[PDB]
């Protein structure tokens, strides 16, 4: 059973209670983007990341309480029709914005209950179809693993891309990797289950991609921290901008990893493994490339089942 989050008087997490961290409700985001929450009916902005005003070039006093009708006149009607009350929380509305203060922005919106969760990130399929085909054309499980890591590395430029496979006891093993010259091998190395604790593995079965763009960057809180609709935490399990567990951030820093990203491989409704990526320098993977990775994760998941059937 989860501890209360830090902003509800909960304790800072230690190695004695890894699995009790409520990672889905950190009440804060990573600073490379901005997040707003809004009422699902009225479009009233209910919460904003502390950096939202500066990030969007808006006046802090104007942004809170303002409506999505006023802030996003060209998207609001499309947004409403796309995400009606009761829709699956995995369902997304995406748009590209031309925003003077921040340049081209990717907007990603989801609904949870009566709340809309809006993520703004800077933004800039021939390669995708080729990548899809390379996975399918892979002859066996090992080659599929190898092609997957190589293809993901080519698409992303990440210093290391691993296929990290979970054993029945939830320990992990790197079973394939593609790596930059000079990086030491993790191939064949195994890791305790506690390195990716049970509540993370659970979240990763439902929300299939997560990342930390800068492992040294302080989280940016949401204000107000609680959803005013409910006087309860804002569900951020489906927000890629959500803050990463400090326990994990520390693990990455100690490994010399500045940027981390993984994609779930789900086989038969169970978490089979992860496409796990590292960069030494902080690194924001373009929003369009993340969508490509999401498609490739789905393809790999299908192909792992197919290839395991071949034996
Ligand atoms: C006491 C808690 C601990 C803890 C928590 C923790 N770890 C994660 C997430 C991940 N851990 C990963 C581990 C590895 N990455 C690697 O490259 C290797 C080995 C080469 C390992 C073992 C991975 C891949 C993740 C997924 C996230 C990612 O891809 O960056 C979480 C959940 C983080 C979040 O989503 O907010 C948590 C709470 N890890 C520990 O070691 C202990 C201290």
Structure description:
With 311 residues, this protein is α+β, with helices and mostly antiparallel strands. It folds into two domains: 1-122 and 216-244, PAS domain (Beta-Lactamase, 2-Layer Sandwich); 123-215 and 245-311, GAF domain (Beta-Lactamase, 2-Layer Sandwich). Helices cover 29% and strands 28% of the residues. It is built from nine helices and 15 strands. It has helices spanning 52-56, 60-63, 68-71, 76-82, 126-137, 141-156, 198-206, 246-254, 287-310, and strands at residues 28-29, 34-39, 45-49, 93-99, 103-112, 115-122, 160-166, 172-179, 190-191, 209-212, 220-223, 226-227, 232-233, 259-267, 270-279. The strands form three sheets. The chain has a seven-stranded antiparallel beta sheet with strand order 1-11-3-2-6-5-4. Strand 14 (259-267) and strand 15 form a beta hairpin. The chain is globular and about 55 Å long. The two termini are 39 Å apart. The ligand *C/C=C1/C(=C/c2[nH]c(/C=C3[NH+]=C(/C=C4\NC(=O)C(C=C)=C4C)C(C)=C\3CCC(=O)O)c(CCC(=O)O)c2C)NC(=O)[C@H]1C binds next to strand 8, strand 10, helix 8, strand 14 and strand 15. The PDB classes it as signaling protein. Keywords: bacteriophytochrome, PAS, GAF, signaling protein. The assembly is monomeric. Crystal structure of monomeric bacteriophytochrome. The protein is Bacteriophytochrome. The organism is Deinococcus radiodurans.
């Amino acid at each position: 059973p989860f501890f209360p989050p830090l902003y509800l008087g909960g304790p800072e997490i230690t190695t004695e209670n890894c699995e009790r961290e409520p990672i889905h409700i950190p009440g804060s985001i990573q600073p490379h983007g901005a997040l707003l929450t809004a009422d699902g009916h009225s479009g009233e902005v209910l919460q904003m990341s502390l950096n939202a005003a500066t990030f969007l070039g808006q006046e802090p006093t104007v942004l809170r309480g303002q409506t999505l009708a006023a802030l996003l006149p060209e998207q609001w009607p499309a947004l409403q029709a796309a995400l009606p009350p009761g829709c699956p929380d995995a369902l997304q509305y995406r748009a590209t914005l031309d925003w003077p203060a921040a340049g081209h922005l990717s907007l990603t919106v989801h609904r949870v209950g009566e709340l809309l969760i809006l993520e703004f990130e800077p933004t800039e399929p021939h390669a995708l179809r080729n990548a899809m085909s390379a996975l399918e054309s892979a002859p066996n499980l090992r080659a599929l693993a190898e092609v997957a890591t190589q293809t993901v590395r080519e698409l992303t430029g990440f210093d290391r891309v691993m296929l990290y496979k979970f054993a029945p006891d939830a320990t992990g093993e790197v079973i394939a990797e593609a790596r930059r010259e000079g990086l030491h091998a993790f191939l064949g190395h195994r890791f305790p289950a506690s390195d990716i604790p049970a509540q993370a593995r659970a979240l990763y079965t439902r929300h299939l991609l997560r990342l930390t763009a800068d492992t040294r960057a302080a989280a940016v809180p949401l204000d107000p921290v609680l959803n005013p609709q409910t006087n309860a935490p804002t569900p951020l399990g489906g927000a890629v901008l959500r803050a990463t567990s400090p326990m994990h951030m520390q693990y990455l820093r100690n490994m010399g990893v500045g940027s981390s990203l993984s994609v779930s491989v789900v086989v038969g409704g169970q978490l089979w493994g992860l496409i796990a990526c590292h960069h030494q320098t902080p690194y924001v993977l373009p929003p369009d490339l993340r969508t490509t990775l999401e498609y490739l994760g789905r393809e790999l998941s299908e192909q792992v089942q197919v290839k395991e059937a071949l034996e």
